[PDB]
Amino acid sequence: MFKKFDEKENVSNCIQLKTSVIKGIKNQLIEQFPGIEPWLNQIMPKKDPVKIVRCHEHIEILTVNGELLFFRQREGPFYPTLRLLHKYPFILPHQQVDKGAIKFVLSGANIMCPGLTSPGAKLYPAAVDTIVAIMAEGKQHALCVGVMKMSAEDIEKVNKGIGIENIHYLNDGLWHMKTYK
Amino acid sequence: GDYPLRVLYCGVCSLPTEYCEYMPDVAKCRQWLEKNFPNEFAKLTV
Ligand code: NA
Ligand SMILES: [Zn+2]
């Protein structure tokens, strides 16, 4: 999703905003991710405002105290950044790819079913279009955030084609936009 | 609160230390880590 970002040249095509409809943007995140309600007190404390950041191809990122929390494209669903998912790794359901798949996910590639049906992989029930955290085999922290393009049962039986779309991965353009000031 | 959890991010390539191998210069990564965090050096050494 971030191809025009990773040309270095940070703080270039990104506008930040002050006064936002703050609570009007929270109540959608609890419905998207239910297991987060007891943690937005720390993630988005009411003592600190939120500041939206909009860079092009029509993406906006929610930030508090500089740190990048969620992002979305146009009016689509919110995705947590990996830096935040790392702090609270239970935000998303997990899908675990095998060790051999890391270097491919790390280069922006979508996840094929061989990546999820391998012995080193671990696939869990997930409906189509659900946001998942891409864990790797011998690794503790999420490698990627994706969205099921096929159901977990389809990935098993069909066992080829695109299983999970690669939306945001370690060392991509959003990853290197550390914080905005 | 058990979270937010703290992950050690490498200082040369900015990634979690467990993913420094898949990066171009792991030598540099391994250098910085033992100079910075010796305890998880021995962890990644095993
Ligand atoms: Na748009
Ligand atoms: Zn590194």
By the CB < 8 Å criterion, does A176 face chain B? yes
Q: Is A115 helix (H, G, I), strand (E, B) or coil?
A: helix
Q: Which helix (H) or strand (E) holds A114?
A: helix A113-117
First and final CA of chain A: distance in angstroms?
22
Region of B2 on the Ramachandran plot (φ > 0 left; ψ -120 to 50 alpha; else beta): alpha
Sign of CA dihedral A85, A87, A93, A96: positive
Q: Give CA–CA dist A41/A3, Å, rounded.
A: 33
Using the beta-carbon criterion (under 8 Å), do A139 and B19 form an inter-chain contact?
A: yes
Token couple for B41: 């050096």
- The residues pairing with A73 across neighbouring beta strands, listed in sequence order, are A59
Q: Is B40 helix (H, G, I), strand (E, B) or coil?
A: helix
Q: Which of A95, A149, A142 has its CA nearest to residue A127?
A: A149
By the CB < 8 Å criterion, does A8 face chain B? no
- Could you tell me which residues come within 8 angstroms of residue A144 by beta carbon, excluding any fewer than 6 positions away? A82, A105, A111, A133, A134, A166, A167, A168, A169, A170
Residue ranges in B1-46 assigned as alpha helix (H): 26-36, 39-45
- Could you tell me which residues come within 8 angstroms of residue A14 by beta carbon, excluding any fewer than 6 positions away? A53, A54, A55, A177, A180
Q: Is A134 helix (H, G, I), strand (E, B) or coil?
A: strand
Closest residue on chain A to B24 (Cα):
A103
By the CB < 8 Å criterion, does A23 face chain B? no
* Closest by Cβ to A87, choosing from B5, B18, B22: B5
From residue B4, alpha-carbon distances to A4, A121, A129, B45 in Å are 30, 26, 27, 27
Q: Which of A82, A163, A89 has its CA nearest to residue A124?
A: A163
Q: Give CA–CA dist A161/A98, Å, rounded.
A: 17
Delimit the domains of chain B by residue range: 7-46
Q: Which residue has the tokens 């189509």?
A: A128
- Resolution in Å equals 2.0
- Whether residue A80 is preceded by a cis peptide bond, meaning omega within 30 degrees of 0, is no
- The amino acid that residue B25 corresponds to is D
CB pairs < 8 Å spanning A and B: 42
Q: Give CA–CA dist A166/A131, Å, rounded.
A: 11
Q: What is the DSSP letter of A81?
A: -
Q: Give CA–CA dist A80/B36, Å, rounded.
A: 29
Burial (CB < 10 A; 0-12, 13-18, 19+), residue A47, is exposed
- The residues pairing with A142 across neighbouring beta strands, listed in sequence order, are none
For residue A63, give its domain range.
1-181
* Closest by Cβ to B22, choosing from A87, A88, A102: A102
* Closest by Cβ to A103, choosing from B3, B7, B22: B22
CATH number where A31 lies? 3.10.400.20
- Could you tell me which residues come within 8 angstroms of residue A72 by beta carbon, excluding any fewer than 6 positions away? A59, A60, A78, A79
CA distance B36 to chain A (A): 20
Q: Which of A79, A106, A83, A97 has its CA nearest to residue A6?
A: A106
Q: Give CA–CA dist A156/A144, Å, rounded.
A: 21
Task: Tally the domains of chain A.
Answer: 1
